[PDB]
Every structure is written in C-alpha cells, then in structure tokens.
C-alpha cells in the first residue's frame, strides 16, 4: 500500500529532476561573463536613528520613502521621519517579544507580532490623535514570523508552525491557510503584482504560493541549512534567499532552477536579511559578522562592504525609489546608507 | 527651519523623554528564562504563548518567562532570549525513562551558539519520589544506565543527616551526568548550578538569587579586568 505511493513519489521526484537537468542548457555566469562589472560601491552612513534601547529585530519602509517603522525588544514601535530623524509616533506593545513589523502600502496602518502568537494591527490616522489597536489576529499556534500587507484589508502572516495564513482585517478571520512546509517558516516576500508570494522555512526549502487559490506551485531546494530571508526580483520572475550556510542563492520561477550562488571563502556566518536594488543589479545581504555586503546579482562578485554596526545586523530595507538603504542591528541603532 | 518643523522636533524630543523614562524604569529588573518538559513541575517551583511571572527577593525584581504551546524539538526563538541573567532548567527526577531525553535537551541548550555566555541554574524537582523509588526497590536505575554498577558515592561530599546512603548515590549519579555534560565544553564562560528540590520547598527563590549574584560576579570579574 504505502510502498507503491513511496515508489511513485520517488519516480515523480526523479522526473522533475530530469526536467530541471534538461532545461539547464547554459549557465548564467557563462552568459554574463561579458558584462562589465559594477565596480566598487562606496556607501556612506547619512542618518543614524537613535531612541531604541534594546535589540532591533525588524524594519519596514513606507511607500513614500520617508516614513520608517522599526521594532525592538523594549516593546515599542517607532515611526521615523528619515529626512529629519524625527519620531512621528511611539506605539507601546502589550508583548515585549516582537519579531516582525509591517507598514501598510496606504500608510494608514502598521502591524507587529512575535512570541505572543498574535498579529496586532494599529490604526495610525484616528480622530482622537493617538494610535490604537484595530484588532488582534489570533489563530496561529507558533511564534509569529514576518508579516506583509496586501492592501488595507488583507495581510499574509508566517508563524512558528509550518503554515502561512491570509487574513481579512474587517472580520478578523483566516480566509486561506497555506500548508506544505515541514519546518518553521521564517521569511516572506510579496510579488509586485500581489498575486504570488514566496516563503522560506527551516526545512532548507522555499515554496511559491498563489493567494487566490491557496495552492503551492513551485518548490526550490539547494540550501544546506535554515533559510532566514527571501526577496523577490524587481521584475517578479526571480527571487533570492539567504540562509545560515553563509550562502545566498538566486532562484528562477520560469525555469524552476537554481540560477546563481553567492558565497565567499572568508564568510562563515549566517545571513539575516536579503534585499535587492531598484533595478536588481545589486544584491544586499545582512550577515552575522556585523557587516552588510553588496553582491553583483549577475556576475556574483562582491561590490562593496557596509560596516559600522556593533552587533548583529538583523534587518535590511531599500526604498521604493531606491535612493537609500536602511540597516538595523542589535546595538539599538539604525543607519541609513546612500 | 519652519514652524511646523520646530513643533515636530519638539514632539520628537517629548517622545525621547518618554522613551528614556520607560527604558530607565525597565532597566532595573533581572530576566530569567524557564525551560523543562511537561513532567518537570516548572509551573510550581516559585511560590510567589508567553507566561509571565514576577517575584522579589531582597528588594530585587526578577522577571521569569515561560514559553508554552510550542514544540520542544527545535527552539530557534532562543536568539531573542539572549543576554538574559540566567536560564532555569527543571529536570523531572525519578523518571528513568526520560532522563536520557532530559540530558539530551540540556546538552542541546548548553551547546547553543546564542547561549555561550549564559549560565544555567539546574533544578532536580521532587526528589521525594526518587527517595521512595530507590527505597522500595523494583525499579532499577542500573537497567537504564550501565554506569550505575561501578559508581561509588564520593567520600568528600556529605548527605543530609537523616538521608539514607542509597538515596545519595542515585542523587549524585544523576547530578554527575549533568555536571559532566556541563564541564565537557563551554571554555569557562558559563557554568551550571545543580540544585536538589521538591514540590514543598520554599527556598528556591533564595537559591536563584544567590546563583544570580554568583553569575553577575563572574561576569564582572571578566568585564572589569581582573581575571
């Protein structure tokens, strides 16, 4: 009974591997060897954001490329005016163990969550003049990982269990549940058209889901350890994953293959955050050695090093217009690079 | 430059004052993390998602945290519990079937890369049931551990005045297992503090206070250039 199913699954895996091998007509490095390198990238810290008194664990830019939300272990969200370094708001949190924060594309709400298993949504534009909890989303059985807004009413969350969820903020219910992982889901990334999203987990695999159907489409392997970050390409046809094996990998949706591997012999530390530039030419990765590295996406060469953080760089962020990069670390400081 | 800009920066300064006051208020507490399996009794060992517990010893505020409802196999949320004062591990004694699992869990926590400089306070709960199990026979710790056939109790350490010799040998073997795992590595940055306790003890808070004082003393012996 079970033997036939196991044999069929093995045969299907072999067939898909053969399909990948037959679709691998050439290597990206061989094609891109004739492309001129980007040279040396020298980014200087332009703003230093102070006010957090604990480890910063999450950040998220706004759509206007000015407002910035950050989360830290002291139990408070701070909304920053990055141009003037002012603090627009300071939102207390019921649980001090916050691991994620999101900024709505409309700029009206922010979301946060962590070890309390609850996604709390805060209303920023109220007639009373203060920030108030809209509702508390409940239903997850594990610690709440990264969360991202689709619009003012739908949000996609990842938990410490092996499931992702789609929520309706107006009614506070779980519309769709995404199952299939065999480990703790750590990172999320939304496609620019908000029709697909990718999730990285602790099973050393990444999966592609569609929102409206709730069905897994593609599965990507190649990492030897836990995946901690994931980020789409600007064109929406590729994505990059960072893991704990000191290796960034570029994956493809249309070819369903590993496309490029970013690694150095001098890097032995895991990767915390992964982000792209506006054009996708530069890949920025936060590392455990207190530094952030800029990788040429096509040529897989190091372009520059970002240094100046005294602890673990825990989060990365690039503005929509691509003007600046904001890095947050465990030393309770956030720096804006340009 | 503009009047609205000045009002905004004044609001930011007020937010800064509030943040500084709140951080100063929250700075004056010691944070402890509590781990152990269902068998442990870790829920009731200090009489006074996330579980919250607060107790005060000698005007010192302690803030103990218990993480419930998760899976005990893989624990990757430990990284947010770094830089705590101590980790409290409660071991269910007198349960010979899961002593190996408890030892494996202690070994996994001790060798975690985020807890290299964090000490562990070890509690062996309800030693009473261990006493009746070793005094009534018909439950051989020799079967579960083959090392309990040439082991002899140390001549240096002493038992309780009324304690039987048979209880003490088993207690010392169980403590020796955890001590050996603790001393197998660590490079001296963090140490373990074994403790024998039961369900009716009321001195565990003082034990935690003394162990925390020792932990902070060893930390300042290295932070300040003495050792």
């Amino acid at each position: 009974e079970l033997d036939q199913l196991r044999q069929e699954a093995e045969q299907l895996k072999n067939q898909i591997r053969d399909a990948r091998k037959a679709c691998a007509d050439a290597t990206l490095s061989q094609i891109t060897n004739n492309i001129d390198p980007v040279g040396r990238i020298q980014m200087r810290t332009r703003r230093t954001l102070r006010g957090h008194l604990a480890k910063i664990y999450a950040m998220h830019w706004g759509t206007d490329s000015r407002l910035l939300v950050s989360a830290s272990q002291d139990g408070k969200l701070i909304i920053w005016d990055s141009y003037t370094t002012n603090k627009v708001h300071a939102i207390p949190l019921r649980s001090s163990w916050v691991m994620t924060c999101a900024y709505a594309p409309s700029g009206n709400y922010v979301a946060c969550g962590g070890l309390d298993n609850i996604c709390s949504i805060y209303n920023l534009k109220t007639r009373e003049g203060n920030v108030r909890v809209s509702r508390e989303l409940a239903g997850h059985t594990g610690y709440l990982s990264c969360c991202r807004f689709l619009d003012d009413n739908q949000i996609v969350t990842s938990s410490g269990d092996t499931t992702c969820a789609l929520w309706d903020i107006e009614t506070g219910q779980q519309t769709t549940t995404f199952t299939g992982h065999t480990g703790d889901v750590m990172s999320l990334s939304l496609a620019p058209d908000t029709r697909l999203f990718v999730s990285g987990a602790c099973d050393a695999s990444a999966k592609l889901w569609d929102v409206r159907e709730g069905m897994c489409r593609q599965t990507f392997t190649g990492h030897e350890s836990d995946i901690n970050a994931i980020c789409f390409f600007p064109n929406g046809n590729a994505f990059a994953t960072g893991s704990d094996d000191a290796t960034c990998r570029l994956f493809d949706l249309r070819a369903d293959q590993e496309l490029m591997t970013y690694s150095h012999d001098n890097i032995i530390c895991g990767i915390t955050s992964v982000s792209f530039s506006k054009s996708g030419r530069l890949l920025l990765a936060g590392y455990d050695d207190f530094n952030c590295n800029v990788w040429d996406a096509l040529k897989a060469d190091r372009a520059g090093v970002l240094a100046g953080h005294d602890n673990r760089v825990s989060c990365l962020g690039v503005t929509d217009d691509g003007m600046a990069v904001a890095t947050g670390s465990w030393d309770s400081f956030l720096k804006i690079w340009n | 430059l503009s009047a609205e800009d000045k009002a905004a920066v004044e609001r930011s300064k007020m937010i800064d004052r509030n943040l500084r006051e709140d951080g100063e208020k929250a700075r004056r507490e010691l944070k402890l993390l509590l781990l152990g399996t269902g068998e442990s009794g870790k829920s009731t060992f200090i009489k006074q998602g996330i579980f919250e517990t607060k107790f005060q010893v000698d005007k010192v505020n302690f803030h103990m945290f218990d993480v419930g409802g998760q899976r005990d196999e893989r624990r990757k949320w430990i990284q947010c519990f770094n830089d705590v004062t101590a980790i409290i591990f409660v071991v269910d004694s007198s349960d010979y079937n899961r002593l190996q699992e408890a030892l494996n869990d202690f070994k996994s926590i001790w060798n975690n890369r985020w807890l290299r400089t964090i000490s562990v306070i070890l509690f062996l709960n309800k030693q009473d049931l261990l006493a009746e199990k070793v005094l009534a026979g018909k439950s051989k710790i020799e079967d579960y551990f083959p090392e309990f056939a040439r082991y002899t109790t140390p001549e240096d350490a002493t038992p309780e005045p009324g304690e039987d010799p048979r209880v003490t040998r088993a207690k010392y073997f169980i403590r020796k297992e955890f001590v050996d795992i603790s001393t197998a590595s660590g490079d001296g940055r963090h140490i373990c503090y074994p403790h024998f306790t039961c369900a009716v003890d009321t001195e565990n808070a003082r034990r935690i206070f003394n162990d925390c004082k020792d932990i902070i003393l060893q930390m300042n012996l290295r932070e300040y250039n003495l050792v």
Partner: single-chain antibody
Amino acid sequence: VQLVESGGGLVQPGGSRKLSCSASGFAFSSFGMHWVRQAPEKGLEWVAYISSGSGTIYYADTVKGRFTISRDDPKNTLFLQMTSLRSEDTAMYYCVRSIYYYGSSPFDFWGQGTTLTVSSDIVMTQATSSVPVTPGESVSISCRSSKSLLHSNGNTYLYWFLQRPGQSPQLLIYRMSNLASGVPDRFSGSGSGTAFTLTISRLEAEDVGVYYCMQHLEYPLTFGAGTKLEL
C-alpha cells in the same frame, strides 16, 4: 471630539476676566492649542498659542503683556487670562486644536466660542468679498500673499477655512493640496508661492458661508479678509 468654552460676559474697561475651554473625546496632552478672535463684524484674528508640553508659548503683538495662556493636562482644560481689557477686545473667542507632526492637519477642530463684550508680518489679501452663486456652478476664490509661502523643504503653508452662518470655522484644505478629513471631493486647491486659488465644483446649499485664507509659515499667523458666497 467636543470643545466647550465658557467664561464670557460684559466687562467694564480695565477689568480682568479668565476664559476656560473644556476638552473631551481626544488625547488633550498630545495636542497644541490656539486662541482665535472673530470680531463682531470683521474677520478672524490670532491671539495666542501653547504647545503640547507648554514648552513654547506665542502671543500676538496686540495682546502681548496683557493676555496670558495656560494649560492644565490632568484636568483637560485650557485657560486664557485677560488683563487691561480695551474696547477692541469685544469679540468671540475660539479654541482651536493642533498636533503638528509630519503629514498631519493642524487646525482641524474648532470650539463653539464665547462672546466677550467690553464697554514685518505677512499680509494675506483676498481682493474679492462677495460673489453671487447659483447651485450646480463652479467658482474660484483667489488669495495673494506679501511673501512667498513655498518653503525650501518643498511644502507651502496655506490653509482654507469655511465658516457657515452661525457656526464655527471648519478646515477645508491644508498645504494648498491636501483635503481635510470629512471634506467632500468637490473642493480643490492649487497655486504657486504667492498666488493661490480654491476651486469649488458642483456648488451646493451647504457652501454659503465665508471662506478664509490662512498662512502658517511663521508667527504670528495671519488670516484673510474673507470671501462670502451668496445664493
């Protein structure tokens, strides 16, 4: 959100009287507050301002040294102490809320007002005073400034207020382009630096009040003469 003001009456010249405004429905401690003077048959005038934390206090030149503003945070009320009253202070006094953060609308809510009876600046010019109107038509109200209100940070500081007959002024447009909450999409504003215009489309019966033009580039704040639309 409710602002109730009390303490008016008939005062002999040279006397002293204190006005009080009680606030409810919002976080009083997080908002700055103003005092605005209406005059019996004239336009709005600015009196005083106190910050959220009482760090900064501003006064008009006509009331400096004789008027005092104070704030009570535990008891959500605002006080205005008047000394050496002249006949020029016979008017109606309003209390206006303000918060002043990035992307906010400061002059959003106004109080009911109290009637008091006794016995280098920027000129904001509204040349037209009365415009006959017909419902369903579109009209424009112009505004001119002595100094350009466009700042080096990219923001212009123009505020449009509507005062229906027998009611307190209501905010319509702030920073010349941002529509206030609760304002229908009929209203729109445009301009550049010195010249400004408020555009109204599909006029209704609720737009019969007097429109005012305010600047917020520097203290003291100045208002326009006022344009009245009559059906």
